[PDB]
Amino acid sequence: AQGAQQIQLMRQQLIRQLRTGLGAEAVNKAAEIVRAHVADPQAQSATVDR
Amino acid sequence: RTGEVLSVPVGDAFLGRVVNPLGQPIDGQGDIAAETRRALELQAPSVVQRQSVSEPLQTGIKAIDAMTPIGRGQRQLIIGDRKTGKTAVCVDTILNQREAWLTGDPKQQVRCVYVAIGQKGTTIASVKRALEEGGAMEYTTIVAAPASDAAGFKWLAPYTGSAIGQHWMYNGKHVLIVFDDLSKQADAYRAISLLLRRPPGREAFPGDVFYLHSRLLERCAKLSDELGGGSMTGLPIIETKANDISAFIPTNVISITDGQCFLESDLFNQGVRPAINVGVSVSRVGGAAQIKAMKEVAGSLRLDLSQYRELEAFAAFASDLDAASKAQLDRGARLVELLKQPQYSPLAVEEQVVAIFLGTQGHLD
Amino acid sequence: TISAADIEGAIEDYVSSFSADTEREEIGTVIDAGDGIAHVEGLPSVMTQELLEFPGGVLGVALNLDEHSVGAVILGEFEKIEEGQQVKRTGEVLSVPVGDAFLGRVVNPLGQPIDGQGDIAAETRRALELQAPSVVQRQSVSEPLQTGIKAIDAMTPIGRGQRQLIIGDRKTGKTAVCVDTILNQREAWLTGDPKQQVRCVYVAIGQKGTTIASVKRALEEGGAMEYTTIVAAPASDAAGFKWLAPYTGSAIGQHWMYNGKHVLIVFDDLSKQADAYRAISLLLRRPPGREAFPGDVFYLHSRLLERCAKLSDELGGGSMTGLPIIETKANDISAFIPTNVISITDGQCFLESDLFNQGVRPAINVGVSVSRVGGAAQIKAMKEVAGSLRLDLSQYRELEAFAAFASDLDAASKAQLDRGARLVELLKQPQYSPLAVEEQVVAIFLGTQGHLDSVPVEDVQRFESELLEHVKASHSDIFDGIRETKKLSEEAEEKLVSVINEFKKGFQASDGSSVV
Amino acid sequence: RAQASGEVAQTLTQADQQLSAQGDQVRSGLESSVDGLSAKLASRILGVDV
Amino acid sequence: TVGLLRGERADEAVIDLAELAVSRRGEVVAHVSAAAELSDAQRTRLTEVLSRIYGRPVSVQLHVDPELLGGLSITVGDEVIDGSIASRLAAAQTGLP
Amino acid sequence: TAGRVVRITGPVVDVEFPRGSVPELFNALHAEITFGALAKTLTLEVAQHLGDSLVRCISMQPTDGLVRGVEVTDTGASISVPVGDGVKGHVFNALGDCLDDPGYGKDFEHWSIHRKPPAFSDLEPRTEMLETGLKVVDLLTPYVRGGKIALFGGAGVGKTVLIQEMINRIARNFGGTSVFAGVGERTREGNDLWVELADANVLKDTALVFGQMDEPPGTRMRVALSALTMAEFFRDEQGQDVLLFIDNIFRFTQAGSEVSTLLGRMPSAVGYQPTLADEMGELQERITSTRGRSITSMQAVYVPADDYTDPAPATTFAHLDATTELSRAVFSKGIFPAVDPLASSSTILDPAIVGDEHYRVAQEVIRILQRYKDLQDIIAILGIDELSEEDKQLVNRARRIERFLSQNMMAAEQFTGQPGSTVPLKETIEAFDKLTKGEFDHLPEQAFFLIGGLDDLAKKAESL
Amino acid sequence: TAGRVVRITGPVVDVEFPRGSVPELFNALHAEITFGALAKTLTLEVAQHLGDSLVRCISMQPTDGLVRGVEVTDTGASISVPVGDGVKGHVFNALGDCLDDPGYGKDFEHWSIHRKPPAFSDLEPRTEMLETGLKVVDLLTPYVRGGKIALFGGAGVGKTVLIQEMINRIARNFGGTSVFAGVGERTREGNDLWVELADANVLKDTALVFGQMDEPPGTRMRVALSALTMAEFFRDEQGQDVLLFIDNIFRFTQAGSEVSTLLGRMPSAVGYQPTLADEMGELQERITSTRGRSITSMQAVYVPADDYTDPAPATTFAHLDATTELSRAVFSKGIFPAVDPLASSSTILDPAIVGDEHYRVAQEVIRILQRYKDLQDIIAILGIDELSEEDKQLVNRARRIERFLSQNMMAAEQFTGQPGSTVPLKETIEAFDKLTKGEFDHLPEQAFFLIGGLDDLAKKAESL
Structure with missing residues (x-):
């Protein structure tokens, strides 16, 4: 039973590793999009107005 | 402002003179022919420059040279209570060297510095008269910081004694330093440091008092042959209150030094003069400081005295004791008599080896 | 197996839940830092004991609020702090996250995970400095906390809501006794009723990392990690963590306690918390009292231990039991911190090192240990069978000290001396071997009712271990009768004596002899 | 106990190879989704439909 | 001021002089930072909001910097508004599970 | 017009007032904590004037969550406690809040806790031997009816057993009204005592004040003065004879040490406060049996580290008519009550x-x-x-x-x-x-x- | 960007920096001494930030000849020491400068001496016995792999022979290497050791670190951490077992107490630094086994006045797992290695x-x-x-x-x-x-x- 509990622990540790690797890639790509959007002063002044 | 850090003059002209810590002549015999000037705080010889200790410093005291040998290059602590003979042991050590100094060989001629910190003026005059009676004033320099002098001089006195000494050491001479005594050194440096509003630590000492004693003592060394093979031997004295050795300055100097001759007032009163507690005094250099003729004799001596100290309680019942240990008791009692010695009468090595031979080989029984 | 849907759904939940409140807030600057304390300028609105945060991802506690600047103690890696760093308010009084999600986790004092296993799914937050329940809210301790050590459960029973001091020397089994107590609860935890289902907190202050890891392993191997949470402040971290580690341990506990759960707290060890508070106080330049401790170490340890109580049924019948460990410098039980904690707790189990080296294990000093709650928390079977044993053992110890050089003595002394030697031999047991109370009562019956009076001293521990397995294989109705009624009825006692006699009539003595 | 201990190690190592192979499939599928999710995060940061 | 500094730091001294000057004028000051200089109508709007976020009329000093890629941050007294898009990026990076 | 908080350090709080409106010493002040679940109204006691309209105060609650710049209002009187015959039966804290019934006593006569001791002209030495039925006490240390009695000893030797024994020997049959003052003992004993006095029915004839170890030093020191104010009301206004049990009065001197080091006064002896003997004296002299009425007080006294030369035990020994002294060594022998026969004494x-x-x-x-x-x-x-x-x-x-x-x-x-x-x-x-x-x-x-x-x-x- | 020396008091030096460039604490700073007889480059370690951009420092070398207002250059890292195979068979000071051949090892990789112990997940969950292959050690007092062993003895008790023994044992049986940390060692004994290990031809596998007594307490404190940072590299990067001698860990405690006093921090029980148990814990916890590799330690430990209650040994003996005592009464029988079988002890x-x-x-x-x-x-x-x-x-x-x-x-x-x-x-x-x-x-x-x-x-x- 303790072996099977540790199987599920390794399963959860893999899900967390995958989840955090995905999240890191989502933010990495999101910084590209923000920098690509913030490329002209029309977006600056709209953002200060917002 | 003068343009230089603390310096003292040095040279051979200091031999047989008495000087204050700045190297000014205090005896009034005349000006000193200063040969060179050294800073007080030059670097000690580093771990690559030294050599192993392997030459005797003949003390001329049976209870030292046979059991806690001092080799030229060692730092040996004469820790004791007041009025137990510390000053007398060190004066004997300086007097003994005359038998060598009369020979012309620089490899044998030990020069001596006695550094008096916080002594009364007549006590320094007594010590000078004791060394004159022995002829030691041919080859010994006294640095006098008498108790009348301001705390600054008491604090510098050990350093200037070492600074005069190092000039001879680096020229390939052999030097003996006696500091008498580092407890009043530490008390002067505590006075200075507290007046300067520096932070006090244990026993009111400033934080660096270990470093103050260490940077003094670690300048004693034996140099390698590439530096002329000179050496300096330190006999720091310290005075212990009520025979404790867990006070701050004792603990520091016991941790710094290579060997510790405990002098106890109880043994002094019981007739064992000099009062060396041979049951607790040790030397870390050991046999490497003794000549072969001394090893061949003294080897069993520490064991015989340890067995005697164990048996001592049975002296009251010596009839009922087994004969094979009754003989050990009777040997031990004769060895304890054999280790006594009158002051100002140091024995040359060739006479003390014969003295220890009498006891150890059983002829005395 | 794993699936992509859960990972994608968790990232999409974080993404959709992301927003910024854009809140206006005071930013201060560090004007001084040193040795684990820092002074902050600005922060006009900071509360006293607000949790600050610093740019390195480091927290601090605002202790002193002067006219110009705020003295903050630094928690964790104060190396990362320097002058001119900005500091911001967390907006919370000094608090820890709490909840059932801590069961089976190792956390540092701040309630951050240290095992590397994952984030903590916290239910809420609790402030550390919430007052203990008042004199009207408490109830009398009336319920057994079974430790599974014969020496303890016989003479010094621990009740739910007691504080029992495990004072001892260095290396005498204090940690072994507390781990044994945490293990013994597993036989209860496997039942569903909150009333029996005791859950546990072990807080390590100033332990070696290997000793914490060894405890984590011993509790995994026993199955105790289902219900134990470990607050770890190992000897390597800053004084502020070693100071908080008991408080956060109690705060994790109290959230369950006020819900009507039962909680066990082990403080291992509360002397190293006192030394950490001595560090933090002397770095603040407050003047020392006795033994260099600041004046308020009593207000450290009492503020801690008074949280442990049993609540009245009007407040939910929950309870918290504290086993503070103290380390004693060469057994001087009259030292400052020993006497401070002895003045707080409801009793102590002094562990004497001079006995431990002779192989008396656990080394319970029966002459100095007490329980000031006493038999009120001890099941009526154990109370009836063992309740004499304590004084009989103490007078055995003084009699042994007298008779050690008596050439001959009266028969009443010799009979008492042999009984006492057999009872001391009876009470020891090996490590990690928790005995259920239904077996402890029978093990002590053997002694107190003199059924051992045939047996030579070298046989006795073997004899007791074997007989408990005899009565576990056949005649189980003894242990069922005891457990199901908490009393040793006469109609069971006769069956017990019959099994005892039937075993003695078949007992090969270890000396090669045999007896009846 | 020794027989069951060995069987636990066989099962734990059996899951180790299974889970690691499954995770390499999972990481591939999420690389498609993460470009979509990251664009949502950029709109959350900016406040506008980039 | 430089004739009588008596132990204060020169940069803090001149900043304290600017804060005294505006206080005598009956206003207050905020420091503002952004990637690009706001329009005049934008500055009038900004003043019109700060005059509702605080009692005294808040004057402004603009410290333009490309670090705050979007939005602006406002500092006044010792309170701050973290309105920069780069702070939103740092929040979304650190907040992640 | 009212004051503002300016400095906070532990339970000590400094407050600034308008130039003319500085409160007198020992006035009570109120302050508000509004954080959340921690929220409460603070009571502060004014302990010093620092000059320039600034005063330094001791907090009666944990200061946790107090923020600089909150408003403080001056009540213009010292801390007050309810006094009256209706006090008996109930449980109170230092501030006179009843723990058994939160609204109770709000309408009673209130006395200021801080008062002068009785005039020397009104004192008379008591000599009537009290009989307790304990061999060691009745033989070697005969207690005095209307005297001051004390129980000394190190931790874990028998204060609480012997005190509850004395409650059973005296208060169970005593015709007058008892007060009990729990100052800084463990809260579990406060609950055990409150239950026991209901079992023995005695509770209806006694008032209990509590101030257990969890409470911050400001109130932990004031609890003894609170309960003493109720006792000296029973003595002076009702003319009954009173029993005043106090446990443990060393915790009073200790709380005085903690607050004093926070007040920033220099340390004395083993780091007690200066004024130690004045503060102890000011508490002790109020507990005296003035001519024609009597207040039999029994006090427990802790001794840290068994050090019977500690300044606190050494200062309190002067105030006492019979001093039972316990000992670790006698306890180890299995003697109980473990009274040291040679150290202990009685003046009668x-x-x-x-x-x-x-x-x-x-x-x-x-x-x-x-x-x-x-x-x-x-x-x-x-x-x-x-x-x-x-x-x-x-x-x-x-x-x-x-x-x-x-x-x-x-x-x-x-x-x-x-x-x-x-x-x-x-x-x-x-x-x-x-x-x-x-x-x-x-x-x-x-x-x-x-x-x-x-x-x-x-x-x-x-x-x- | 450079700072100025603003105040000097003994070994302690304060430096002022430009407002934006204040160094992080525990950075190494360099300063010059220009006087001809005392020409030095002087290394300062940053201890505290005093405000006003002032930084409190302590000197690793004597401060004599230093002048106010000299330039101070920050290095931007902690004290760093060389690491690599070419460290073996050389002698280093605490600061990583070689004493056997000056300027050797400048080209090696350098590591910060101040680094954290292993993460909780990486510690080995059970103790393993070290089979050292010596009868007396293995039978009576088994050593713990990655544990700490106390050693007692002196001259004429074989102590240096036992050191040469254990070095040979680790080199030959486990394919590891040794490090020796001369924490406050005698310069004579350091040269005797250097010549003894050279004559035995074991020095080829040993790295020597000396913090000599001649130098100020900052160096006698940091030497142990320097040696431990060499050992950490050999464990983690080379993947070898390592044996770390410390002689003598009492002088590490003492040096720490003296630095704390120079910094003006208030001293605790018997005068040690107030951080003592953490000051020591940040060394001793860092000696351990992880990922199947281990740093074993032997520590000579002086006891002041022979009492095992003094905070220096009471702290130290919390960490260590085994105790080998060498006895002159055994050595004089001719029994080598003279390990006393009754006075020595082990906890495994x-x-x-x-x-x-x-x-x-x-x-x-x-x-x-x-x-x-x-x-x-x-x-x-x-x-x-x-x-x-x-x-x-x-x-x-x-x-x-x-x-x-x-x-x-x-x-x-x-x-x-x-x-x-x-x-x-x-x-x-x-x-x-x-x-x-x-x-x-x-x-x-x-x-x-x-x-x-x-x-x-x-x-x-x-x-x-």
């Missing part, structure tokens, strides 16, 4: 007050125990056998007299299961006179533990 | 961690040696002829067991020319089980001296 133990037949016995017992406590140094190395017959005769009965001073107290019944015992003074005098003369020397030492009276001695000795 | 010696047979045999050998130690007085006073036959048969075994603890250790190979032995554990626990049962009593004592293993005893018995 003289032939004029107790009679010659009591005094001569007491002096003979003390002489025997003193000679034993001198021979102890040899006894520890060589055993009994080395002693001369004139000394070995003495030590044999010393060991018996020592063990016989033990008693099975009514309180310990809940632990040992043996019932309690009360012996009258006359039977005690007769037994110790017989023991010192030797009429029991032939019995074994073990027969003498935890007896009580002479017929119970016989009954025990017959079973051996 | 439990039936749960070593086999039940190992624990039994260790308890029997301790019992026999304890009996002989109790008889030695009768032997010395009255002679063997005063004994009975039953105990004289015990002494006949005890003499042989005491001899059989001796080993021909690899350090002696310089002199004897015979090789050193390495007995397996499963051999030595048979050999002492047989020897306690007396099966070898017909052999003379000379057959057991220096013998090594049981088959060697069989050879030497037939040679004699």
Whole structure:
């Protein structure tokens, strides 16, 4: 039973590793999009107005 | 402002003179022919420059040279209570060297510095008269910081004694330093440091008092042959209150030094003069400081005295004791008599080896 | 197996839940830092004991609020702090996250995970400095906390809501006794009723990392990690963590306690918390009292231990039991911190090192240990069978000290001396071997009712271990009768004596002899 | 106990190879989704439909 | 001021002089930072909001910097508004599970 | 117009007031904490004036969540406690909030806690011996009705057992009204006492004040003055005789130390406050039986690290008429109540007050125990056998007299299961006179533990 | 960007920096001393930030000749020490500068001496016994892999021989290397050690670090952390087992107390630094095993006044797992390596961690040696002829067991020319089980001296 509990622990540790690797890639790509959007002063002044 | 850090003059002209810590002549015999000037705080010889200790410093005291040998290059602590003979042991050590100094060989001629910190003026005059009676004033320099002098001089006195000494050491001479005594050194440096509003630590000492004693003592060394093979031997004295050795300055100097001759007032009163507690005094250099003729004799001596100290309680019942240990008791009692010695009468090595031979080989029984 | 849907759904939940409140807030600057304390300028609105945060991802506690600047103690890696760093308010009084999600986790004092296993799914937050329940809210301790050590459960029973001091020397089994107590609860935890289902907190202050890891392993191997949470402040971290580690341990506990759960707290060890508070106080330049401790170490340890109580049924019948460990410098039980904690707790189990080296294990000093709650928390079977044993053992110890050089003595002394030697031999047991109370009562019956009076001293521990397995294989109705009624009825006692006699009539003595 | 201990190690190592192979499939599928999710995060940061 | 500094730091001294000057004028000051200089109508709007976020009329000093890629941050007294898009990026990076 | 908080350090809070509106010393101030679940109204007591309209205050609650710049209002009077006959039966904290019924007593007469002691012209020394039915107490330290009595000792030797015993010996039958002041003892005992006084029905005739160890030092020190204000109301306004039990009064001096170091006063001796003897004196002198009325007070006194030269025990010893002193060493022997016979004393133990037949016995017992406590140094190395017959005769009965001073107290019944015992003074005098003369020397030492009276001695000795 | 020296007081130096460039604490700063006789580059470590951009520092070298307002250049990192295989067979100061050949190792990788201990997840969850291959060590006092061992002794007790032994043991049996940390060592003893390890030709595998007594307490404190940072590299990057000598850990405690006093921090019990247990914990916890690799430690530990309650040893003995004491009374018999079998102790010696047979045999050998130690007085006073036959048969075994603890250790190979032995554990626990049962009593004592293993005893018995 303790072996099977540790199987599920390794399963959860893999899900967390995958989840955090995905999240890191989502933010990495999101910084590209923000920098690509913030490329002209029309977006600056709209953002200060917002 | 003068343009230089603390310096003292040095040279051979200091031999047989008495000087204050700045190297000014205090005896009034005349000006000193200063040969060179050294800073007080030059670097000690580093771990690559030294050599192993392997030459005797003949003390001329049976209870030292046979059991806690001092080799030229060692730092040996004469820790004791007041009025137990510390000053007398060190004066004997300086007097003994005359038998060598009369020979012309620089490899044998030990020069001596006695550094008096916080002594009364007549006590320094007594010590000078004791060394004159022995002829030691041919080859010994006294640095006098008498108790009348301001705390600054008491604090510098050990350093200037070492600074005069190092000039001879680096020229390939052999030097003996006696500091008498580092407890009043530490008390002067505590006075200075507290007046300067520096932070006090244990026993009111400033934080660096270990470093103050260490940077003094670690300048004693034996140099390698590439530096002329000179050496300096330190006999720091310290005075212990009520025979404790867990006070701050004792603990520091016991941790710094290579060997510790405990002098106890109880043994002094019981007739064992000099009062060396041979049951607790040790030397870390050991046999490497003794000549072969001394090893061949003294080897069993520490064991015989340890067995005697164990048996001592049975002296009251010596009839009922087994004969094979009754003989050990009777040997031990004769060895304890054999280790006594009158002051100002140091024995040359060739006479003390014969003295220890009498006891150890059983002829005395 | 794993699936992509859960990972994608968790990232999409974080993404959709992301927003910024854009809140206006005071930013201060560090004007001084040193040795684990820092002074902050600005922060006009900071509360006293607000949790600050610093740019390195480091927290601090605002202790002193002067006219110009705020003295903050630094928690964790104060190396990362320097002058001119900005500091911001967390907006919370000094608090820890709490909840059932801590069961089976190792956390540092701040309630951050240290095992590397994952984030903590916290239910809420609790402030550390919430007052203990008042004199009207408490109830009398009336319920057994079974430790599974014969020496303890016989003479010094621990009740739910007691504080029992495990004072001892260095290396005498204090940690072994507390781990044994945490293990013994597993036989209860496997039942569903909150009333029996005791859950546990072990807080390590100033332990070696290997000793914490060894405890984590011993509790995994026993199955105790289902219900134990470990607050770890190992000897390597800053004084502020070693100071908080008991408080956060109690705060994790109290959230369950006020819900009507039962909680066990082990403080291992509360002397190293006192030394950490001595560090933090002397770095603040407050003047020392006795033994260099600041004046308020009593207000450290009492503020801690008074949280442990049993609540009245009007407040939910929950309870918290504290086993503070103290380390004693060469057994001087009259030292400052020993006497401070002895003045707080409801009793102590002094562990004497001079006995431990002779192989008396656990080394319970029966002459100095007490329980000031006493038999009120001890099941009526154990109370009836063992309740004499304590004084009989103490007078055995003084009699042994007298008779050690008596050439001959009266028969009443010799009979008492042999009984006492057999009872001391009876009470020891090996490590990690928790005995259920239904077996402890029978093990002590053997002694107190003199059924051992045939047996030579070298046989006795073997004899007791074997007989408990005899009565576990056949005649189980003894242990069922005891457990199901908490009393040793006469109609069971006769069956017990019959099994005892039937075993003695078949007992090969270890000396090669045999007896009846 | 020794027989069951060995069987636990066989099962734990059996899951180790299974889970690691499954995770390499999972990481591939999420690389498609993460470009979509990251664009949502950029709109959350900016406040506008980039 | 430089004739009588008596132990204060020169940069803090001149900043304290600017804060005294505006206080005598009956206003207050905020420091503002952004990637690009706001329009005049934008500055009038900004003043019109700060005059509702605080009692005294808040004057402004603009410290333009490309670090705050979007939005602006406002500092006044010792309170701050973290309105920069780069702070939103740092929040979304650190907040992640 | 009102003040503002300007500095906070632990339970100590500095507040600035308008130039003319500075409050007098010991006025109570209010402050608000509004954080969340921690929210409460703080009470502060003004302890110093720092100058420039700034005052420094001791907090009666934990300061946790107080923020600089909150408004403080001055109530213009000291901390007040409800007094009246309706106080009896209920439980109170230092501020006079009832714990049993939150609204109760709000409408009573309130007295200021801070008051002057009675005038020297109104004092008179009390001499009437109180009988407690404890052998060691009634023999060697006869307590004084209307005096001040104290129980000393290190941690874990018997304060709480012996105090609840004394409650059972005196307050169970005393015709007057009792107050109990829990100052800085463990809260679990406060609840055990509150339950027990309801079981024995006595609660209806006593008021309890509590101030247990969790409370911050500001209130922990003020609890003793709160409960004393109720006691001196019963003394002066109702003219009843009062019992005032206090436990543990060393916690008062300790809380005074903590607040004093936070107030920033220099440390004294082992780091107690200066004023220690003035603060202790100001509490103790108020507990006195002025002419025509009486206040029998019993005080427990802790001793840290068993150090009977600690400044706190050393200062309190001056104020006391009978001082029972407990000891670790005597406790280790299995003697209970573990009273040290030689250190402990009573001022009324003289032939004029107790009679010659009591005094001569007491002096003979003390002489025997003193000679034993001198021979102890040899006894520890060589055993009994080395002693001369004139000394070995003495030590044999010393060991018996020592063990016989033990008693099975009514309180310990809940632990040992043996019932309690009360012996009258006359039977005690007769037994110790017989023991010192030797009429029991032939019995074994073990027969003498935890007896009580002479017929119970016989009954025990017959079973051996 | 450079700073200025603003205040100097003994070893303590304050520096002021430009507002934006204040160094992070524990950074190394460099400063110049230009006076001709005392020309130095002076290394400062940052201790505190005093505000106003002032930084409190402590000097790693004497401050003599330093002048106010000299320039200070920050290095931007902690004190860093060289790491790599080319560190072996060289002598370094705490600051990583070589003493055997100046300027050596500048090109090596440098690591920060201030780095964190292992993460919780990486520690090994159980202790493993180190099979060092020395009879007395393995049987009576088993060493713990990655544990700390206290060592006691002095000159004329073989202590340097035991060091050379353990260095050879780690190099040959485990393929590891050793580091030696001279924490406040005598410069004479440091040169005697350097020449002794060179003459034994073991220095090729040892890195030496000396913090000499001559230098200020900042260096005598940091030397232990320097040596530990070399050892951490060998464990983590080279993947070797490492053996770390410390001589003497009391001087690490003392140096820390003196720095704390120079920084003006208030001293605690008997005058140590207030951080003591953390100051020490940040060293001792960092010595451990992880990821199957280990830093074993031997620590010589002085005890002030011989009392194991003083905070310096009381702190230190919390960390360490084993205690080897060397005795002159054993060395004078000719028993090498002179490990005292009764005064030495170990904490891994439990039936749960070593086999039940190992624990039994260790308890029997301790019992026999304890009996002989109790008889030695009768032997010395009255002679063997005063004994009975039953105990004289015990002494006949005890003499042989005491001899059989001796080993021909690899350090002696310089002199004897015979090789050193390495007995397996499963051999030595048979050999002492047989020897306690007396099966070898017909052999003379000379057959057991220096013998090594049981088959060697069989050879030497037939040679004699």
